[PDB]
Amino acid sequence: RVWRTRTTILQSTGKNFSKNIFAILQSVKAREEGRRTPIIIIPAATTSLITMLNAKDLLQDLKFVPSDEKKKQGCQRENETLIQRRKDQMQPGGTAISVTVPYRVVDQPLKLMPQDWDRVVAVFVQGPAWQFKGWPWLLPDGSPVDIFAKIKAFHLKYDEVRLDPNVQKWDVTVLELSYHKRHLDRPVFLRFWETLDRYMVKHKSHLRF
Amino acid sequence: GEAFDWLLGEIESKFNQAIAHPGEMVGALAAQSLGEPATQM
Amino acid sequence: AGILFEDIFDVKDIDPEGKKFDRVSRLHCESESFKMDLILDVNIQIYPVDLGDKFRLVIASTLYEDGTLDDGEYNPTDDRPSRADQFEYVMYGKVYRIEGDETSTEAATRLSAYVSYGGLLMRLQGDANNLHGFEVDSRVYLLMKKLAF
Amino acid sequence: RDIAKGHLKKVTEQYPDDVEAWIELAQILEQTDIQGALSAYGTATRILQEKVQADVPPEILNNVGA
Amino acid sequence: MNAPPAFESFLLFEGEKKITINKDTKVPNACLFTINKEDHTLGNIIKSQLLKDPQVLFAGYKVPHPLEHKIIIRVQTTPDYSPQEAFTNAITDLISELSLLEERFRVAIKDKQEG
Amino acid sequence: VLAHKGYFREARDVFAQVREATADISDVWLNLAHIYVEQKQYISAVQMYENCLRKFYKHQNTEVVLYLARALFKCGKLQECKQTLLKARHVAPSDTVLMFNVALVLQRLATSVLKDEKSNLKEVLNAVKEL
Amino acid sequence: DNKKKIIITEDGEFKALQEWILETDGVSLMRVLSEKDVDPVRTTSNDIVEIFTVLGIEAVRKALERELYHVISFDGSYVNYRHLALLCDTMTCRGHLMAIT
Amino acid sequence: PSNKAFEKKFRFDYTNERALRRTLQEDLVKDVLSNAHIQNELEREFERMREDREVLRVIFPTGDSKVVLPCNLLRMIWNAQKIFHINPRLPSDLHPIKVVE
Amino acid sequence: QSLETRAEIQELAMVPRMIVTPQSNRPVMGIVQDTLTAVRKFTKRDVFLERGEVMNLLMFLSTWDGKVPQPAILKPRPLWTGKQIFSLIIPGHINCIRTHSTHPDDEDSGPYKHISPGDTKVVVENGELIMGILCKKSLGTSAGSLVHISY
Amino acid sequence: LPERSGVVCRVKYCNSLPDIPFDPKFI
């Protein structure tokens, strides 16, 4: 009695390949037969914690600066907040080198050109809905939800201040800043860039940077 | 380096809150901190 | 892609020190091609495994074959194609530690990547060329299937 | 053959002193479970030597060797 | 002296809404239904029925304080189906289930007696 | 045949099923390793060639050792490639292909040492001799 | 260990040494301290009144804080050193052992 | 710390060219390998810790390493590592002089 | 009986301001008595919950942000681990290492040091429970306990 | 453009059949 023969030596212990491989061959046979700009928001109203004048410190240097001194210093204004920033990013083989292409954060929204308006991906809110009047996606009833419910918003406030009732009802990310501990600012802004990057890469990666 | 700045900032912050507050009745606290465990003996 | 690792393992020992829990047991497996060591806690109640069982283990960074990078929240209603369709047992968890034979003079030849699946631990100990996508504090999926041979 | 394997397993479990049932089971196990076949032939050998007190047949020795 | 009268578990006061809906703020498509003067007899069936809805992402309930006659059921469904209708339907057809049970039990009873 | 036709994804799926069914066919490991090289997954391929050699051959199969050398070369591991090709040449010293590949790896190593100004005198003198 | 001698090794290890110590019933700290072969640096009475008469008010502060810590730490419980230091400072603020009576 | 352990844990030798590339980046290791001022500052810091060693050994004899202090440095460091995704497997940009100063 | 007194009480003697005591720098309020037994049983490695049971337990987190965590077991059936829900309770991003009561002393020396066989050695990172079982060692009124770190 | 000279190695996808099994015979 012999159990291993010329036929059984070639066979698998229990798996059948025919169904899987013929499907693969059918796919191959079918082939042989031949069968971008993104956007983000900020508040223009001058009582806001982030302003058109200190914005580039908060977002570029990841450094909080009271606007008090910025106007007291006589600081001059940009037409809008668009950065061509350097940040060295690691290749899938691990070597880091920086590359950037237009991002626009909102500072003077109604001057915006027809090409750009509907680009919002993430959004810095002040609170009152009048901040968005005339913005596209604003619902004709005056409701801004088509922006905030589909887009990851941001709102910059002091840690101590009781959250704004519109913002708390709205789909907006709160950022808590200290009055006196300047060192705690950097991780907050890092969290901002983290969340913004998550959003851009998951939902607006096809937009160009 | 980015984290090292933050750590030095946190160490002073957490240290300054640990400072004894003027007005603290440390005598009453000491008396209670010694009298309370004496009840468990 | 997003497949951080993948290999055929065969179970060499179940809870060698004796069963510490009822619904969870250790699998002391060794791989066949990359020659990896593996300690894995499986819910032995829903997914019973025996000694000498061979299973395909595919620690993946995401479940979408297009590699579109999930966001870690649970939502069962989704028509997108998922790797879970061709796998029997699927876990989720963080990598919480990576450990090798590092020396002050040269890098590690071997790495042990630790993963915690919401409490069930794992340790994938191999050589320092396989465990490269592993980076502490990052989500990973275990995607394993027993082999009908 | 799988049915026979099941029946002989029940037979050997009910009557472990039946040498023939152990040998027949061993002959079936040779195809898929070498350790099971060895255990079956070893049991038959043990029963023959200790209880029948007869020498081991050459066929069993050959099969154990294989 | 401070015993509440037993009726307060089911009798409606002046102004009490039988049910109050409030949108939940932390996520889209999620509401909080607050039943006044109700308990686990109504909370477990609605919670469980909501879970059979394949379009219900989250469904569950709590009694904010057992001596408070208020319960909170929370529902959150896919964006293409409001929680309101999720609740409405799960009761629309839960009523049917109980009527179907009434009809089937009534026939089983008449079938047992002299049958 | 699918791999030879260049349908490496489909061929991978076929060989992956075969390896799932049996661990004892040497050619299945080689075919998988070849696909890993073609998919530029050199780190995995090198490991499969080494484990294949240790598991199925009681002697150094020069064709498999050459495949390992090819993977190490594409991986940029020129030092390991040199040593692997020398191991193959020690077994089959008359094979001009092994001699050619050794000469090529030596030239690449010298080219690298000479291209990078960080290289010291002992290194550069060795590179000159290798060239 | 607090009753064992502890002396640093040349390589820096603390290396406690066990030495025969005599634990008396009754006290005469000054006479015992002056006996030859008695270590005058560590020998102590565990009796604060003796400490005041033999080593003075500051020595009293230190000795009182240790004995009070000893009783309060016997069952293993812990009290922050602030409360012991404050109590011992007040009991010795006026240069004499001010009883809490 | 023993005499040998003190060096291996707190010296920060600046002569081993190979190791510094493991811990620091390429634009830091030539600053610590060529600049004499940085090496002198690092040696002064080491002498400072060597003196603090003797200070601690006279403050806490008996090797009582446990202490009560305001900020939990180990935990704050750990919070920092998790807040910035430090990844303790890459070379860090923290130039040593920034730490000493 | 006056705002000046209510304010003083609210800002000096309010209960949460009294969690940590100057007497011994440790907490004096902790997870104690029955709920400590329940949380020990709940944080074991072999505790699993259905969607139906977790979606009900999350109803009781006040500070929950409303997004159900990805279950530690997705197939063959969605299953959440006890530690997974308990991570939702731990506030912010706490980082501490504690040891469960039944931790073997000879475990930190041998292998399985960072992967404990018995699920001892509580490890909480980034505000999540990575390993361990909670008991008085990590939730009680003891120095370095989890509530102490939280405070 | 001159193709950068690679390692001279022809990749062969093999399907070598196993030797015929002359296993010991059972009686």
UniProtKB/TrEMBL annotation, chain B:
Lineage top rank: taxon: Eukaryota
Cellular compartments annotated: Chromosome; Cytoplasm; Nucleus
Family recorded in the similarity comment: Belongs to the RNA polymerase beta' chain family.
Function recorded in the entry: DNA-dependent RNA polymerase catalyzes the transcription of DNA into RNA using the four ribonucleoside triphosphates as substrates. RNA-dependent RNA polymerase that catalyzes the extension of a non-coding RNA (ncRNA) at the 3'-end using the four ribonucleoside triphosphates as substrates. An internal ncRNA sequence near the 3'-end serves as a template in a single-round Pol II-mediated RNA polymerization reaction. May decrease the stability of ncRNAs that repress Pol II-mediated gene transcription.
Name the record gives this protein: DNA-directed RNA polymerase subunit
Location of this fragment in the whole protein: 1062 to 1102 of 1970
TrEMBL record, chain C:
Described purpose of this protein according to its UniProt entry: DNA-dependent RNA polymerase catalyzes the transcription of DNA into RNA using the four ribonucleoside triphosphates as substrates. Common component of RNA polymerases I, II and III which synthesize ribosomal RNA precursors, mRNA precursors and many functional non-coding RNAs, and small RNAs, such as 5S rRNA and tRNAs, respectively.
Swiss-Prot/TrEMBL GO biological process terms: DNA-templated transcription
Any one GO molecular function term: DNA-directed RNA polymerase activity
Pfam annotation, one family: RNA_pol_Rpb8
Compartments where located: Nucleus
Gene3D superfamilies for this protein: Nucleic acid-binding proteins (2.40.50.140)
SMART domains, A to Z: RPOL8c (SM00658)
Chief localization: nucleus
Gene Ontology CC entries for this record: RNA polymerase I complex; RNA polymerase II, core complex; RNA polymerase III complex
Key words of the record: DNA-directed RNA polymerase, Nucleus, Transcription
Lineage: Eukaryota, Metazoa, Chordata, Craniata, Vertebrata
Statement: the UniProt record of this protein carries the keyword Oxidoreductase: no
Cross-referenced PANTHER family: DNA-DIRECTED RNA POLYMERASES I, II, AND III SUBUNIT RPABC3
Entry keyword annotation includes Transcription: yes
Naturally occurring in which organism (per UniProt): Sus scrofa
Family in the record: Belongs to the eukaryotic RPB8 RNA polymerase subunit family.
Protein name according to UniProt: DNA-directed RNA polymerases I, II, and III subunit RPABC3
UniProtKB/TrEMBL annotation, chain E:
Pfam family, one: RNA_pol_L_2
UniProt protein name: DNA-directed RNA polymerase II subunit RPB11-a
Organism of provenance: Sus scrofa
Entry-linked HAMAP family: RNApol_arch_Rpo11
Any single GO BP term: transcription by RNA polymerase II
Any one annotated GO CC term: RNA polymerase II, core complex
Family: Belongs to the archaeal Rpo11/eukaryotic RPB11/RPC19 RNA polymerase subunit family.
Superkingdom of origin organism: Eukaryota
Signal peptide (residue range): none
Compartment annotation: Nucleus
Keywords: DNA-directed RNA polymerase, Nucleus, Transcription
InterPro entries: RBP11, RBP11-like, RBP11-like_dimer, RNA_pol_Rpb11_13-16kDa_CS, Rpo11-like
DNA-directed RNA polymerase RBP11-like dimerisation domain sequence ranges: 31-103
GO MF annotation, one: DNA binding
